Ligand binder design. Sequence first.
Ligand SMILES: Nc1ncnc2c1ncn2[C@@H]1O[C@H](COP(=O)(O)O)[C@@H](O)[C@H]1O
Ligand SMILES: Nc1ncnc2c1ncn2[C@@H]1O[C@H](COP(=O)(O)O)[C@@H](O)[C@H]1O
Ligand SMILES: Nc1ncnc2c1ncn2[C@@H]1O[C@H](COP(=O)(O)O)[C@@H](O)[C@H]1O
Ligand SMILES: Nc1ncnc2c1ncn2[C@@H]1O[C@H](COP(=O)(O)O)[C@@H](O)[C@H]1O
Ligand SMILES: O=P(O)(O)OC[C@H]1O[C@](O)(CO)[C@@H](O)[C@@H]1O
Ligand SMILES: O=P(O)(O)OC[C@H]1O[C@](O)(CO)[C@@H](O)[C@@H]1O
Ligand SMILES: O=P(O)(O)OC[C@H]1O[C@](O)(CO)[C@@H](O)[C@@H]1O
Ligand SMILES: O=P(O)(O)OC[C@H]1O[C@](O)(CO)[C@@H](O)[C@@H]1O
Ligand SMILES: [Mg+2]
Ligand SMILES: [Mg+2]
Ligand SMILES: [Mg+2]
Ligand SMILES: [Mg+2]
Ligand SMILES: [Mg+2]
Ligand SMILES: [Mg+2]
Ligand SMILES: [Mg+2]
Ligand SMILES: [Mg+2]
Lengths: 309, 311, 311, 309
Amino acid sequence: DVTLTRFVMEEGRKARGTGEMTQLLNSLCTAVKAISTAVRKAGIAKLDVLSNDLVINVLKSSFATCVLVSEEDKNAIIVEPEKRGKYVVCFDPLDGSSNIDCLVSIGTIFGIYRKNSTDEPSEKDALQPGRNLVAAGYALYGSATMLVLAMVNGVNCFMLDPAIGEFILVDRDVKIKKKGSIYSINEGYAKEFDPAITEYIQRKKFPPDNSAPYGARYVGSMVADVHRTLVYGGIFMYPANKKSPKGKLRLLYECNPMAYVMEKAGGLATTGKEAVLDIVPTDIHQRAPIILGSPEDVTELLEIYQKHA
Amino acid sequence: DVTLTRFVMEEGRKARGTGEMTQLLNSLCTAVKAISTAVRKAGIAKLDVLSNDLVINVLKSSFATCVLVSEEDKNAIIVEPEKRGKYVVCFDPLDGSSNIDCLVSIGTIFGIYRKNSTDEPSEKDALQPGRNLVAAGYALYGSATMLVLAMVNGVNCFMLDPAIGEFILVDRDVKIKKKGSIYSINEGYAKEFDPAITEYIQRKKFPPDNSAPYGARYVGSMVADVHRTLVYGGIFMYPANKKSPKGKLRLLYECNPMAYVMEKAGGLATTGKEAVLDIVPTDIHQRAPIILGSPEDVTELLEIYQKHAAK
Amino acid sequence: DVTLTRFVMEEGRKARGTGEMTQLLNSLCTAVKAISTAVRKAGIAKLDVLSNDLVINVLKSSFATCVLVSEEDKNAIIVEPEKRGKYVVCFDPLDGSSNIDCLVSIGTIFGIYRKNSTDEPSEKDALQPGRNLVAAGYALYGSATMLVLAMVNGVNCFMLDPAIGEFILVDRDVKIKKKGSIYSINEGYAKEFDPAITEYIQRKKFPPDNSAPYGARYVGSMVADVHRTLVYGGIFMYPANKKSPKGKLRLLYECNPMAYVMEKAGGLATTGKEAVLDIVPTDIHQRAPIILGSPEDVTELLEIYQKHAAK
Amino acid sequence: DVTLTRFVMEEGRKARGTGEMTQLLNSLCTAVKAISTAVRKAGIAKLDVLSNDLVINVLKSSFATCVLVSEEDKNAIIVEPEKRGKYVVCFDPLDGSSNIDCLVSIGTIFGIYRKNSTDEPSEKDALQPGRNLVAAGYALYGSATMLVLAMVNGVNCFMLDPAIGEFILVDRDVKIKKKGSIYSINEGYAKEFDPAITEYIQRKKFPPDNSAPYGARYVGSMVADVHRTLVYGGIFMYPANKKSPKGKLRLLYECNPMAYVMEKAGGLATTGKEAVLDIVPTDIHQRAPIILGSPEDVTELLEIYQKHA
Ligand SMILES: Nc1ncnc2c1ncn2[C@@H]1O[C@H](COP(=O)(O)O)[C@@H](O)[C@H]1O
Ligand SMILES: Nc1ncnc2c1ncn2[C@@H]1O[C@H](COP(=O)(O)O)[C@@H](O)[C@H]1O
Ligand SMILES: Nc1ncnc2c1ncn2[C@@H]1O[C@H](COP(=O)(O)O)[C@@H](O)[C@H]1O
Ligand SMILES: Nc1ncnc2c1ncn2[C@@H]1O[C@H](COP(=O)(O)O)[C@@H](O)[C@H]1O
Ligand SMILES: O=P(O)(O)OC[C@H]1O[C@](O)(CO)[C@@H](O)[C@@H]1O
Ligand SMILES: O=P(O)(O)OC[C@H]1O[C@](O)(CO)[C@@H](O)[C@@H]1O
Ligand SMILES: O=P(O)(O)OC[C@H]1O[C@](O)(CO)[C@@H](O)[C@@H]1O
Ligand SMILES: O=P(O)(O)OC[C@H]1O[C@](O)(CO)[C@@H](O)[C@@H]1O
Ligand SMILES: [Mg+2]
Ligand SMILES: [Mg+2]
Ligand SMILES: [Mg+2]
Ligand SMILES: [Mg+2]
Ligand SMILES: [Mg+2]
Ligand SMILES: [Mg+2]
Ligand SMILES: [Mg+2]
Ligand SMILES: [Mg+2]
């Protein structure tokens, strides 16, 4: 019976916020419901772009933002002085484009930052390390629509009841299991994996200790593979290959938001040499290898890396 | 503008049917919508058991049914005499159990067969090779809901407009791509694959012709991985392993209906040694290893198998 | 559990129909859902024109239609030859215009007739007395959406479950109450009523038998006031006045279909001098005064009319 | 593009409210959407009571109330000390019961009050005159679902987009037309009307000045007849008859909330001798004759009354 609006509103009162951030989040939610309806093809009797147009618009109207970065735009959107609020938002309107046409789960990922600089708003305002995130999360358009919000005191999962257009709290304080039995990677790149990644895979299939082999799962949508990682445990890997030197997934709105959710839930997120949330961005569309999930599974792979010095 | 309701009514007419089989499809459709709405969690403020009850119940009220086989039931279900029809229906009420809790795509699989017999309806009526199907179909509850239906005439895809509860033809007389670039399998069983499967995988990662490697995709729900296979091309496979020697997927309401759809769409479906559609089942819950998808992809693998048997 | 889709398919079968007319109902249903969703303002974040386009378009794609008459069109619409069927359809796409803006109940009225002729389909095919209808029906977009359908066999009501886009039988073989207690008319035209209507009203407020006065109800939408009349009993009336001498409501897609439903349900429908169903129209947009509802109520009024003509 | 949540939230920030009232209104809205879905019979493949159970529950959880009065309960609901907020709410969960079964428009009416007394919460806390209302309004389940909210600075109309479960602002600052051409009453009681009511009707049908006669309309649901009055202008009348000496409609949750909406929109609401909002309630289920709508139409009838001294 507890709804996202009420949760968000409450959290607003504790913090003693002025109402801007709350406003922002209500706005986000609404955009998410408008995308969910669109993705379930209501009125079917473009998608990548509809999404973006929605997140941009509803965000601007929140009067809570000053800088926007979307995976759909070369340049940072600087907001009109008259709609200008204090937050910097980095979103991925519709994540999982390769999966759109085959009807497989796709999502929306976001990250909220606070204007640090005291100068005119600009792209550098979104080049803050993931560690500075105030809020981060995602909406999965799967069998059902779900919004996962992460904030300092934890990760919570709200189910969208499309009947009355309300997200309902379904999981109180998500924590990922210490150790899982599922691995996610696209193994199509085997020929260009680095030595650590290569050795890790072998262990998941031929465990030296003779334990059960991990199961494999890779939806092809970061948002779906990641959500499963949070919920079932296990590991997700989009490492840097020879064809994609710096990884494929993008730091600001794909790597950072999900890293934050992972740690806030007791998991880890690393590039293999460094915590993702600690990297200082040099480009709003930068890419960075990513490995995330159960603390023990990630740690194991890190040990292989240092072992490969 | 062409609704599924319209499509089936027209098809039944062109076939000069008595409407029983047309009723059947309508009922299967109504159930799909019902299952969809529940899966999307409308009214939230077990999913497998509900799906099953809906199908069993709808199929009975159809008055088109004589025998039913659910993956949810130890034994076939024989329809009471006042409600009997000439049709046998093999269904998997909700496929992709491992993905339910994590909100990934899941679906409903179905296959339909005419009674082959004069005698009291029994289990035996359900033990017909996939080649004998009248229609095979799957509903996918993914980003959007899709119902795919295959009949002697071809494969068609309909999207569910949840705004009006209607399925709308979106892709007509669908044909799978001859050769793809995406391979779908659970590599976790690697230690247990046979030499052919193993050789094949290596070949998707390290192509001898030095071309670009196939990309990998494996949702975990046979309805999801198969649908993508139909629409993007490529190949899907769930071969035999230790835990399941004979394959995991079930012949009657998993392999057969998908192999039917896949072949109507100009694709292949093999266990590795024979055509899935030609196996004569002897147990309604029988399992079978399966390889399906684009012709050149399954063929390449079949050649690896033949190459090993030939040695 | 009995859907409208199922009901019509079964009915068509029992009638041994070729399915054309069955297709027609399906198409009318699909349109109703479509109109409903628009009326409920889904996707908001002209209603009369949209309704019309939907119906005209759906009815044509049905391939069951030869001629169409819309209250929205100056002239009958003749269906192109490749899409022709044997059916003539008189419809009012959205009834209750005065109530649209204020969000009160509005609906869609329809009547269906077989072509009576050998000759090129024309307007003339639509000029058949209401007695000649195969089916008459109305969808009410009120608190909930309801589709009422009447055929030679009776009147049935189906509720729209918008969760699954399906109409569900809720009231079967409906029969209007013999005598009611609610009278429905626009008393604003009082200065212009004829002596009978006037006497009658006075009689509902000051009953000579000293019983309790009928209560008054008048929504302004003929679909709303008629539906209530069918379900609670009582009487509805829109007689002749100065601004409309011949009555306001239209014979073909307002009076006729409602009189058909009302009679199948054991009720009456008169202009005051004759049965609405028996008038032979001579203009597709012709008007007629109407009195309908419970038998004893319309009869009481008819007696007042006869009593004046007799003097 | 402006939603009820954002409007309500904003108004919250101007007033510099602590968030309780805002919370309350978000709660109300949600209850209203849950009733709308129920009334459109979603899941049909009791109503009077479902409604009440919803309004009670969601209101209690708002933590914004201390006293509730529903047309469905003999006694005032006094809220548990631990969920106790400062507001007193008077609602009519589902108005138009006689109309439920025939599918004709029905609604939900509410009125919000502020705890005046400093003693233990009790029924007297809801016996405040309508004039003290802080907020009042209604939700009409018609062809479409609409929420009309009235508050000190005006009346606004929000359309419920059932697609994404959001009310959308559709009318900025409602004002009723000075004069209408529609009258609403149940004329079935003609034999027990008082002289003023009787004479008024005659004028609407046989205007002495020979002008056009008013049209008649009476849905049978206060919420529908009243909403039409607001939107098209004209008059609505549920006068006291001989069979119902004090009127039928009830002061706290039927007469008062709609009076407030009417005045706040430039119209009038009277019992024929007195402004409705000025009556001091002596019972939570009291009844009081009501006449409301266009200022000129109501005033005309008042003149007949004083003329009938
Ligand atoms: N709705 C909310 N939920 C959680 N934290 C919030 C909320 N509103 C404000 N805060 C915290 O308080 C700060 C000030 O909020 P504001 O004045 O609304 O910008 C934010 O940076 C948050 O860290
Ligand atoms: N709706 C339909 N779509 C496709 N084929 C049909 C349909 N109805 C009947 N048929 C064909 O005609 C046969 C007899 O149908 P029935 O009389 O409905 O049992 C079926 O087994 C179908 O192969
Ligand atoms: N779905 C149906 N419901 C009721 N009667 C029908 C139906 N279909 C056909 N009939 C009866 O059979 C006649 C021939 O129908 P058709 O062959 O569909 O044009 C119609 O005019 C109806 O009176
Ligand atoms: N959301 C709101 N909209 C309009 N007025 C409000 C709102 N919140 C508070 N107010 C006004 O400010 C007072 C204090 O609100 P609160 O502290 O939230 O109880 C209320 O009695 C209202 O008169
Ligand atoms: O096909 P690949 O290289 O495995 O890419 C999969 C990834 O691509 C993305 O679409 C990034 O564009 C992610 O959403 C997903 O995780
Ligand atoms: O999890 P595994 O062993 O890879 O098997 C996955 C398969 O399980 C199934 O649920 C069959 O039971 C299929 O839907 C899916 O393809
Ligand atoms: O407003 P009036 O003149 O009372 O007429 C009301 C009638 O108008 C109509 O809209 C006919 O045009 C009917 O739906 C309704 O019964
Ligand atoms: O049938 P009557 O006496 O005109 O009552 C109509 C009124 O009754 C009520 O239902 C009050 O219970 C109102 O909603 C409506 O305005
Ligand atoms: Mg994107
Ligand atoms: Mg992305
Ligand atoms: Mg199942
Ligand atoms: Mg299955
Ligand atoms: Mg119209
Ligand atoms: Mg009309
Ligand atoms: Mg009530
Ligand atoms: Mg009431």
